[PDB]
């Protein structure tokens, strides 16, 4: 199916001494492979993928290289948009910075992105065409024109479209193993009375990959959402991921009600009853 | 400032079982800013061994980590997890339920 | 593979 690489910065100001706290991610689907914080020692980019560990001395050298120019670019901007919004010394503020490119089953480029955030609100994102930007107010308006004049758009355009999608295609051959493969959920229900008269019904869906999932109740083959709870989808810490929908119902009934799943690892939808 | 108050979730890796190690994870997401205390307890007890993921964010900029110890179940022993955040006035305690 | 440059806002 479909695949991305993206990019994940953060970094938080420290103002009574020194550099900004400054932490980077960077993922293939819902896999880490690379990171760099600023507290650690060895201030290098570092494999969290055995796949990448394939990789050589240069690519280290120049992602390590890349991402400190990525910490001093960071650096420079919080100064200056503490100076945009009139703000003090005293206070901690941050800027987030996601980029990268998705590809479709045919690994072939489909979209682009590159997008900011200072203090949690958005800040300035380059637009789907890759030629332009959105800016939400009038200082993110003085970096769109700063930007323009620099041509920094054509820039990322090359790069979103050329070597981050090149690069994509190479880590996804170099880690098939697990990068191509699909864990399908393992799912199980769990039952509990809260009275005599109420019961709850619980569909678990266990060690999936990639994260993406649907989970619905339905009650006599009709979409239940009334009554159902709904958990956010959860790292395991392994890799995989896991995901729960329960559903209250009266004590008697539970035969009425089926759970469906739907994931890229399951070939067709799977129904559970309790 | 915007302000998000972080939810929680705590859980072992794998399906629990008594004398079987295991990891209790207490994932924290939906949380700005980044500022952010976790700490993983054994019948009230603040467990030392603790590690945490990498910081990242959401779509919406919000902020996610996973927190995470080694740990052998037992009939007896009660797991939580503990959250601080400016936007808690109090710690907040989510015990683990195994049963769920 | 990062972007070889990050322009200042």
């Known amino acids: 199916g479909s695949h991305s690489m993206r990019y994940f910065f953060t970094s938080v100001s420290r103002p009574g001494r020194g550099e900004p706290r400054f932490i980077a991610v960077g993922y293939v689907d819902d896999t880490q492979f690379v990171r760099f914080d600023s507290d650690a020692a060895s201030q290098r980019m570092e494999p969290?993928?055995?796949?990448?560990?394939?990789?050589?001395?240069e690519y280290w050298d120049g992602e390590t290289r890349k991402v400190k120019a990525h910490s001093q670019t960071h650096r420079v901007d919080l100064?200056?948009?503490?100076?945009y919004y009139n703000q003090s010394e005293a206070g901690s503020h941050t800027v987030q910075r996601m980029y990268?490119?998705?590809?479709?089953?045919?690994?072939?480029?489909?979209?682009?992105?590159?997008?900011?955030?200072?203090?949690?609100?958005?800040?300035?994102?380059?637009?789907?065409?890759?030629?332009?930007?959105?800016?939400?107010?009038?200082?993110?308006?003085?970096?769109?024109?700063?930007?323009?004049?620099?041509?920094?758009?054509?820039?990322?355009?090359?790069?979103?479209?050329?070597?981050?999608?090149?690069?994509?295609?190479?880590?996804?051959?170099?880690g098939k193993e697990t990068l191509q493969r699909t864990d399908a959920p393992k799912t199980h229900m769990t039952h509990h009375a809260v009275s005599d008269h109420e019961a709850t019904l619980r569909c678990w869906a266990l060690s999936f990959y990639p994260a993406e999932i649907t989970l619905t109740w339905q009650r006599d083959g009709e979409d239940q959402t009334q009554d159902?709870?709904?958990?956010?989808?959860?790292?395991?810490?392994?890799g995989t991921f896991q995901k729960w929908v329960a559903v209250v119902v009266p004590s008697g009934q539970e035969q009425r009600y089926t759970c469906h799943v739907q994931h890229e690892g399951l070939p067709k939808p799977l129904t559970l009853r309790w | 400032?915007?302000?998000?108050?972080?939810?929680?979730?705590?859980?072992?890796?794998?399906?629990?079982?008594?004398?079987?190690?295991?990891?209790?994870?207490?994932?924290?997401?939906?949380?700005?800013?980044?500022?952010?205390?976790?700490?993983?307890?054994?019948?009230?007890?603040?467990?030392?061994?603790?590690?945490?993921?990498?910081?990242?964010?959401?779509?919406?900029?919000?902020?996610?980590?996973?927190?995470?110890?080694?740990?052998?179940?037992?009939?007896?022993?009660?797991?939580?997890?503990?959250?601080?955040?400016?936007?808690?006035?109090?710690?907040?305690?989510?015990?683990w339920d195994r049963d769920m | 593979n990062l972007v070889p440059m990050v322009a200042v806002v």
């Open chain 1, 100 to 174: 990268g490119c998705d590809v479709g089953s045919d690994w072939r480029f489909l979209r682009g992105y590159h997008q900011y955030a200072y203090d949690g609100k958005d800040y300035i994102a380059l637009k789907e065409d890759l030629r332009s930007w959105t800016a939400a107010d009038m200082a993110a308006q003085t970096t769109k024109h700063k930007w323009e004049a620099a041509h920094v758009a054509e820039q990322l355009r090359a790069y979103l479209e050329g070597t981050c999608v090149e690069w994509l295609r190479r880590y996804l051959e170099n």
């Open chain 1, 79 to 83: 100064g200056t948009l503490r100076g």
């Open chain 2, 1 to 95: 400032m915007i302000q998000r108050t972080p939810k929680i979730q705590v859980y072992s890796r794998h399906p629990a079982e008594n004398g079987k190690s295991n990891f209790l994870n207490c994932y924290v997401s939906g949380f700005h800013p980044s500022d952010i205390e976790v700490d993983l307890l054994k019948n009230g007890e603040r467990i030392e061994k603790v590690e945490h993921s990498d910081l990242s964010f959401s779509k919406d900029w919000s902020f996610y980590l996973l927190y995470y110890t080694e740990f052998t179940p037992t009939e007896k022993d009660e797991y939580a997890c503990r959250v601080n955040h400016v936007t808690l006035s109090q710690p907040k305690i989510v015990k």
């Open chain 1, 228 to 238: 159902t709870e709904l958990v956010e989808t959860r790292p395991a810490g392994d």
């Open chain 1, 48 to 57: 969290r993928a055995p796949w990448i560990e394939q990789e050589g001395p």
